[PDB]
């Protein structure tokens, strides 16, 4: 169904975009911290 699939696509886009920012920031912080030792 078009409206259902457009809503599912919007939720997947939002979830993956948000997760990409969160893991990018967490990974950069953890890697910089580990490297500093």
Curated annotation (Swiss-Prot):
Subcellular location: Secreted
Residues with the Arginine amide modification: 37
Gene Ontology, cellular component aspect: extracellular space
GO molecular function annotations of the record: antifreeze activity; ice binding; identical protein binding
Record bears the keyword Heme: no
Result, substituting residue 13 to V: No significant effect on 3D structure
Result, substituting residue 33 to E: No significant effect on 3D structure
Source superkingdom: Eukaryota
Known tissue expression: Detected in liver and in blood serum (at protein level).
Induction section of the entry: By winter conditions, at least in part by water temperatures of below 8 degrees Celsius.
Main location: secreted
Keywords noted in UniProt: Amidation, Antifreeze protein, Repeat, Secreted, Signal
The protein's role, per its UniProt record: Contributes to protect fish blood from freezing at subzero sea water temperatures. Lowers the blood freezing point. Binds to nascent ice crystals and prevents further growth.
UniProt similarity note: Belongs to the type-I AFP family.
Protein name, entry field: Ice-structuring protein A
